[PDB]
Protein backbone atom coordinates (compact mmCIF):
# COMPACT_ATOMS: atom_id res chain seq x y z
CA UNK A 1 0.00 0.00 0.00
CA UNK A 2 1.20 3.51 -0.83
CA UNK A 3 1.10 6.23 1.83
CA UNK A 4 1.51 9.98 1.28
CA UNK A 5 5.15 10.58 0.39
CA UNK A 6 5.05 14.34 1.07
CA UNK A 7 6.67 16.07 4.05
CA UNK A 8 4.22 16.09 6.96
CA UNK A 9 5.73 19.43 8.05
CA UNK A 10 4.35 21.11 4.93
CA UNK A 11 0.81 20.37 6.09
CA UNK A 12 1.15 20.22 9.88
CA UNK A 13 2.55 22.22 12.79
CA UNK A 14 3.77 19.70 15.36
CA UNK A 15 4.33 20.42 19.04
CA UNK A 16 4.67 18.64 22.36
CA UNK A 17 5.01 14.91 23.05
CA UNK A 18 1.80 13.20 24.21
CA UNK A 19 3.32 9.79 24.83
CA UNK A 20 5.74 7.11 23.67
CA UNK A 21 6.12 3.42 22.91
CA UNK A 22 9.17 1.26 22.21
CA UNK A 23 9.05 2.01 18.49
CA UNK A 24 6.58 4.90 18.54
CA UNK A 25 6.24 8.48 19.73
CA UNK A 26 3.10 10.64 19.66
CA UNK A 27 3.04 14.40 19.15
CA UNK A 28 0.28 17.02 19.26
CA UNK A 29 -0.14 18.75 15.89
CA UNK A 30 -2.29 21.26 13.99
CA UNK A 31 -3.48 20.99 10.39
CA UNK A 32 -2.56 24.17 8.52
CA UNK A 33 -5.39 24.21 5.96
CA UNK A 34 -8.15 23.75 8.56
CA UNK A 35 -6.62 24.86 11.85
CA UNK A 36 -7.87 21.66 13.50
CA UNK A 37 -5.74 19.62 15.89
CA UNK A 38 -4.79 15.96 15.58
CA UNK A 39 -2.33 13.52 17.10
CA UNK A 40 0.66 12.51 14.97
CA UNK A 41 2.09 9.05 15.71
CA UNK A 42 5.62 8.37 14.46
CA UNK A 43 6.25 4.65 14.02
CA UNK A 44 9.81 3.45 13.40
CA UNK A 45 10.30 1.07 10.46
CA UNK A 46 12.82 -1.74 10.94
CA UNK A 47 13.91 -1.36 7.28
CA UNK A 48 16.11 -4.47 7.54
CA UNK A 49 14.50 -7.87 8.18
CA UNK A 50 17.26 -8.88 10.61
CA UNK A 51 16.81 -5.74 12.70
CA UNK A 52 15.00 -5.62 16.04
CA UNK A 53 14.85 -1.82 16.24
CA UNK A 54 11.58 -1.24 14.41
CA UNK A 55 8.16 -2.44 13.32
CA UNK A 56 7.76 -4.70 10.28
CA UNK A 57 5.75 -3.30 7.38
CA UNK A 58 3.41 -6.27 7.69
CA UNK A 59 2.47 -5.17 11.21
CA UNK A 60 2.13 -1.51 10.25
CA UNK A 61 -0.05 -2.22 7.23
CA UNK A 62 -2.31 -4.48 9.29
CA UNK A 63 -2.89 -1.72 11.86
CA UNK A 64 -3.59 0.93 9.21
CA UNK A 65 -5.92 -1.44 7.36
CA UNK A 66 -8.01 -2.00 10.47
CA UNK A 67 -7.96 1.70 11.38
CA UNK A 68 -9.15 2.71 7.90
CA UNK A 69 -12.17 0.46 8.36
CA UNK A 70 -13.52 1.65 11.70
CA UNK A 71 -15.97 4.52 12.20
CA UNK A 72 -17.51 4.67 15.66
CA UNK A 73 -17.85 7.37 18.34
CA UNK A 74 -16.23 4.99 20.86
CA UNK A 75 -13.13 4.10 18.86
CA UNK A 76 -10.27 6.28 17.65
CA UNK A 77 -10.37 7.60 14.09
CA UNK A 78 -7.62 7.67 11.46
CA UNK A 79 -7.25 10.88 9.46
CA UNK A 80 -4.15 10.52 7.22
CA UNK A 81 -1.03 8.38 6.74
CA UNK A 82 2.42 9.72 5.84
CA UNK A 83 5.60 7.77 5.10
CA UNK A 84 9.24 8.81 4.90
CA UNK A 85 12.59 6.97 4.84
CA UNK A 86 12.59 6.05 8.53
CA UNK A 87 9.00 6.48 9.73
CA UNK A 88 5.35 5.83 9.03
CA UNK A 89 3.31 8.75 10.40
CA UNK A 90 -0.33 8.24 11.43
CA UNK A 91 -2.53 11.33 11.75
CA UNK A 92 -5.11 10.34 14.34
CA UNK A 93 -8.05 11.82 16.22
CA UNK A 94 -6.73 13.85 19.15
CA UNK A 95 -7.80 12.24 22.41
CA UNK A 96 -6.92 14.68 25.17
CA UNK A 97 -8.85 13.67 28.31
CA UNK A 98 -6.26 11.13 29.48
CA UNK A 99 -6.94 7.67 30.91
CA UNK A 100 -10.40 6.79 32.21
CA UNK A 101 -8.92 5.32 35.39
CA UNK A 102 -7.02 8.50 36.26
CA UNK A 103 -10.24 10.47 35.83
CA UNK A 104 -12.12 8.08 38.12
CA UNK A 105 -9.28 8.31 40.65
CA UNK A 106 -10.15 11.96 41.27
CA UNK A 107 -13.84 11.57 42.09
CA UNK A 108 -15.29 11.61 45.60
CA UNK A 109 -17.42 8.49 45.17
CA UNK A 110 -18.49 6.12 42.39
CA UNK A 111 -21.61 3.95 42.47
CA UNK A 112 -22.05 0.75 40.46
CA UNK A 113 -24.57 2.65 38.34
CA UNK A 114 -22.15 5.43 37.41
CA UNK A 115 -19.49 2.84 36.58
CA UNK A 116 -21.77 0.84 34.28
CA UNK A 117 -22.29 4.06 32.31
CA UNK A 118 -18.61 4.13 31.36
CA UNK A 119 -18.50 0.34 30.94
CA UNK A 120 -21.40 0.41 28.46
CA UNK A 121 -19.37 2.78 26.28
CA UNK A 122 -16.57 0.25 26.22
CA UNK A 123 -19.03 -2.57 25.54
CA UNK A 124 -20.45 -0.54 22.64
CA UNK A 125 -17.03 -0.10 21.06
CA UNK A 126 -16.24 -3.80 21.36
CA UNK A 127 -19.73 -4.65 20.07
CA UNK A 128 -18.87 -2.60 16.98
CA UNK A 129 -15.44 -4.21 16.46
CA UNK A 130 -16.65 -7.79 16.94
CA UNK A 131 -19.49 -7.11 14.51
CA UNK A 132 -16.72 -6.49 11.95
CA UNK A 133 -14.87 -9.60 13.17
CA UNK A 134 -12.08 -7.46 14.63
CA UNK A 135 -10.35 -8.58 17.81
CA UNK A 136 -8.44 -5.84 19.64
CA UNK A 137 -6.15 -8.23 21.58
CA UNK A 138 -4.86 -5.39 23.78
CA UNK A 139 -7.77 -4.22 25.93
CA UNK A 140 -6.42 -2.74 29.15
CA UNK A 141 -6.83 0.48 31.24
CA UNK A 142 -4.00 2.29 29.38
CA UNK A 143 -6.01 2.02 26.16
CA UNK A 144 -9.32 3.28 27.51
CA UNK A 145 -9.26 7.04 27.04
CA UNK A 146 -11.43 10.12 27.47
CA UNK A 147 -12.04 12.50 24.57
CA UNK A 148 -12.62 15.47 26.88
CA UNK A 149 -12.17 15.64 30.66
CA UNK A 150 -14.29 18.75 31.14
CA UNK A 151 -17.84 17.94 29.99
CA UNK A 152 -21.03 16.69 31.72
CA UNK A 153 -20.86 13.19 30.20
CA UNK A 154 -17.30 12.27 29.07
CA UNK A 155 -16.87 10.09 25.99
CA UNK A 156 -14.82 6.86 26.06
CA UNK A 157 -12.34 6.19 23.26
CA UNK A 158 -10.61 2.87 22.63
CA UNK A 159 -7.09 3.32 21.23
CA UNK A 160 -3.94 1.42 20.16
CA UNK A 161 -4.76 -1.16 17.49
CA UNK A 162 -1.20 -2.44 17.08
CA UNK A 163 -2.16 -6.01 18.01
CA UNK A 164 -5.61 -5.99 16.41
CA UNK A 165 -6.51 -8.77 13.97
CA UNK A 166 -9.33 -9.38 11.52
CA UNK A 167 -10.59 -12.88 12.34
CA UNK A 168 -10.00 -15.20 9.39
CA UNK A 169 -12.32 -18.14 8.79
CA UNK A 170 -10.28 -21.13 7.67
CA UNK A 171 -7.01 -20.37 9.43
CA UNK A 172 -6.55 -20.55 13.18
CA UNK A 173 -4.43 -17.81 14.71
CA UNK A 174 -1.88 -18.64 17.39
CA UNK A 175 0.53 -16.26 19.09
CA UNK A 176 1.94 -15.19 22.45
CA UNK A 177 1.80 -11.44 23.10
CA UNK A 178 0.33 -8.67 25.24
CA UNK A 179 0.48 -7.70 28.91
CA UNK A 180 0.42 -10.81 31.20
CA UNK A 181 -2.15 -9.67 33.78
CA UNK A 182 -4.69 -8.78 31.07
CA UNK A 183 -4.27 -11.63 28.56
CA UNK A 184 -6.59 -14.64 28.23
CA UNK A 185 -5.52 -18.25 29.03
CA UNK A 186 -5.50 -19.24 25.33
CA UNK A 187 -2.88 -16.54 24.71
CA UNK A 188 -0.78 -17.88 27.57
CA UNK A 189 -0.99 -21.52 26.43
CA UNK A 190 -0.47 -20.82 22.71
CA UNK A 191 -3.98 -21.91 21.71
CA UNK A 192 -6.35 -20.75 18.92
CA UNK A 193 -7.34 -17.08 19.32
CA UNK A 194 -10.60 -15.35 18.49
CA UNK A 195 -12.97 -12.61 19.64
CA UNK A 196 -13.40 -14.38 22.99
CA UNK A 197 -10.02 -13.09 24.17
CA UNK A 198 -11.38 -9.53 24.20
CA UNK A 199 -14.23 -10.70 26.45
CA UNK A 200 -11.75 -12.04 29.01
CA UNK A 201 -10.00 -8.65 29.17
CA UNK A 202 -13.32 -6.91 29.71
CA UNK A 203 -13.81 -9.22 32.68
CA UNK A 204 -10.41 -8.22 34.05
CA UNK A 205 -11.08 -4.50 33.51
CA UNK A 206 -14.48 -4.73 35.24
CA UNK A 207 -12.92 -6.53 38.21
CA UNK A 208 -10.37 -3.71 38.60
CA UNK A 209 -12.98 -0.98 38.05
CA UNK A 210 -15.06 -2.24 40.99
CA UNK A 211 -12.23 -2.99 43.42
CA UNK A 212 -8.96 -1.33 42.41
CA UNK A 213 -7.25 -4.71 42.62
CA UNK A 214 -5.90 -6.87 39.78
CA UNK A 215 -7.38 -10.40 39.80
CA UNK A 216 -4.36 -12.35 38.53
CA UNK A 217 -1.37 -10.15 39.39
CA UNK A 218 1.35 -12.25 41.01
CA UNK A 219 4.77 -11.52 42.50
CA UNK A 220 6.52 -12.50 39.26
CA UNK A 221 5.60 -12.52 35.57
CA UNK A 222 5.68 -16.32 35.63
CA UNK A 223 3.40 -16.43 38.67
CA UNK A 224 0.91 -14.12 36.95
CA UNK A 225 0.74 -16.31 33.83
CA UNK A 226 0.18 -19.35 36.05
CA UNK A 227 -2.74 -17.65 37.79
CA UNK A 228 -4.35 -16.85 34.44
CA UNK A 229 -4.00 -20.39 33.09
CA UNK A 230 -5.44 -21.88 36.28
CA UNK A 231 -8.10 -19.15 36.47
CA UNK A 232 -6.94 -18.57 40.04
CA UNK A 233 -8.84 -15.53 41.27
CA UNK A 234 -10.97 -14.61 44.26
CA UNK A 235 -13.50 -11.99 45.31
CA UNK A 236 -11.58 -10.95 48.42
CA UNK A 237 -13.88 -9.59 51.12
CA UNK A 238 -11.48 -6.68 51.62
CA UNK A 239 -12.33 -5.43 48.13
CA UNK A 240 -15.76 -6.83 47.22
CA UNK A 241 -17.77 -6.29 50.40
CA UNK A 242 -20.04 -3.65 48.88
CA UNK A 243 -20.33 -5.36 45.50
CA UNK A 244 -23.61 -6.81 44.23
CA UNK A 245 -24.24 -10.40 43.14
CA UNK A 246 -25.03 -9.30 39.58
CA UNK A 247 -21.68 -7.57 39.14
CA UNK A 248 -19.91 -10.73 40.34
CA UNK A 249 -22.03 -12.89 38.04
CA UNK A 250 -21.11 -10.59 35.15
CA UNK A 251 -17.40 -11.03 35.93
CA UNK A 252 -17.67 -14.78 36.63
CA UNK A 253 -19.17 -15.42 33.18
CA UNK A 254 -16.28 -13.58 31.49
CA UNK A 255 -13.37 -15.10 33.43
CA UNK A 256 -13.88 -18.59 32.00
CA UNK A 257 -11.10 -20.94 30.84
CA UNK A 258 -13.01 -22.45 27.89
CA UNK A 259 -13.62 -19.73 25.23
CA UNK A 260 -16.77 -21.41 23.89
CA UNK A 261 -18.25 -21.33 27.40
CA UNK A 262 -17.29 -17.67 27.79
CA UNK A 263 -19.87 -14.87 27.53
CA UNK A 264 -20.09 -12.97 24.23
CA UNK A 265 -20.38 -9.23 23.65
CA UNK A 266 -24.02 -9.43 22.52
CA UNK A 267 -24.74 -11.52 25.62
CA UNK A 268 -22.91 -9.14 27.94
CA UNK A 269 -25.10 -6.27 26.73
CA UNK A 270 -28.16 -8.36 27.63
CA UNK A 271 -26.89 -9.24 31.10
CA UNK A 272 -29.24 -7.97 33.86
CA UNK A 273 -26.38 -6.03 35.48
CA UNK A 274 -25.97 -4.00 32.29
CA UNK A 275 -29.60 -4.11 31.16
CA UNK A 276 -31.83 -4.58 34.26
CA UNK A 277 -34.90 -6.66 33.36
CA UNK A 278 -37.14 -5.43 36.19
CA UNK A 279 -37.76 -4.10 39.70
CA UNK A 280 -34.98 -3.95 42.30
CA UNK A 281 -32.41 -5.45 39.95
CA UNK A 282 -31.68 -1.82 39.15
CA UNK A 283 -31.51 -1.16 42.90
CA UNK A 284 -28.38 -3.31 43.20
CA UNK A 285 -26.38 -1.04 40.88
CA UNK A 286 -28.21 2.14 41.89
CA UNK A 287 -27.55 1.76 45.62
CA UNK A 288 -24.24 -0.09 45.98
CA UNK A 289 -20.88 1.52 45.22
CA UNK A 290 -17.15 1.22 44.56
CA UNK A 291 -14.61 1.68 47.36
CA UNK A 292 -12.75 4.83 46.31
CA UNK A 293 -9.97 4.32 48.85
CA UNK A 294 -8.63 1.06 47.42
CA UNK A 295 -9.32 2.35 43.92
CA UNK A 296 -7.31 5.55 44.35
CA UNK A 297 -4.35 3.34 45.25
CA UNK A 298 -4.46 1.46 41.94
CA UNK A 299 -4.12 4.42 39.57
CA UNK A 300 -1.41 5.61 41.96
Catalytic positions, written as ranges: 138
Asked if residue 19 belongs to a known ligand binding site, the reply is yes
Number of residues in contact with Mg ion, rule: CB under 5 A? 2
Residue 33 near which of ligand NH4, Mg ion, none (CB within 5-8 Å, type-dependent) = ligand NH4
Count other C-beta atoms under 10 Å from residue 193's C-beta: 21
| Distance separating alpha carbons of residues 162 and 136, to the nearest angstrom | 8
Residue nearest to Mg ion (CB): 161
Asked if residue 238 belongs to a known ligand binding site, the reply is no
- 3-state DSSP call for residue 166? strand
Compare residues 33 and 48 and give the one whose CB is closer to ligand NH4. Answer: 33
Residue 161 near which of Mg ion, ligand NH4, none (CB within 5-8 Å, type-dependent) = Mg ion
The DSSP-derived string for 27-54 is EEEEETTT--EEEEEEEEB--STT-SSS
Q: Minimal distance in Å, beta carbon 110 to Mg ion?
A: 28
Q: Which residues, numbered 106-165, are part of the site for Mg ion (CB under 5 A)?
A: 160-161
Q: Minimal distance in Å, beta carbon 33 to ligand NH4?
A: 5
Asked if residue 90 belongs to a known ligand binding site, the reply is no
Residue 234 near which of ligand NH4, Mg ion, none (CB within 5-8 Å, type-dependent) = ligand NH4
Residue 42 near which of Mg ion, ligand NH4, none (CB within 5-8 Å, type-dependent) = none
Helix axes 292-299, 196-211, angle to 10 degrees: 120
| Distance separating alpha carbons of residues 297 and 101, to the nearest angstrom | 11
The answer to whether 66 and 164 have CB atoms below 8 angstroms apart is yes
Q: Minimal distance in Å, beta carbon 233 to ligand NH4?
A: 7
Compare residues 129 and 256 and give the one whose CB is closer to ligand NH4. Answer: 256
Q: Which of 244, 231, 255 is CA-nearest to residue 282?
A: 244
Q: Please give the span between the terminal C-alpha atoms of the chain, in angstroms, as a whole number.
A: 42
Asked if residue 99 belongs to a known ligand binding site, the reply is yes
Compare residues 37 and 111 and give the one whose CB is closer to ligand NH4. Answer: 37
Compare residues 93 and 102 and give the one whose CB is closer to Mg ion. Answer: 93
Q: Which of 299, 288, 300 is CA-nearest to residue 246?
A: 288
The answer to whether 88 and 81 have CB atoms below 8 angstroms apart is yes
Residue 22 near which of Mg ion, ligand NH4, none (CB within 5-8 Å, type-dependent) = none
Question: Could you say whether residue 23 binds Mg ion (CB under 5 A)?
Answer: no
Asked if residue 110 belongs to a known ligand binding site, the reply is no
CA 46 to chain centre: 26
| Distance separating alpha carbons of residues 196 and 234, to the nearest angstrom | 21
Name the residues that contact ligand NH4, by CB under 6 A: 11, 33, 232, 234
Which residues contribute to the site for Mg ion (CB under 5 A)? 160-161
- Residue ranges of the binding site: 18-26, 41, 93-95, 99, 160
Amino acid sequence: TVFRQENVDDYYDTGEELGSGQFAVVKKCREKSTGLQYAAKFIKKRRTKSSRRGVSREDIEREVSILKEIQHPNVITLHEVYENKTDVILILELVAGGELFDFLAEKESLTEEEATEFLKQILNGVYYLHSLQIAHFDLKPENIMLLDRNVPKPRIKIIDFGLAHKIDFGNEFKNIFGTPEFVAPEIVNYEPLGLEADMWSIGVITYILLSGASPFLGDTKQETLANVSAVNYEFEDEYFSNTSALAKDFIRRLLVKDPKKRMTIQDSLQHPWIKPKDTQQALSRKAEAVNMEKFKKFAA
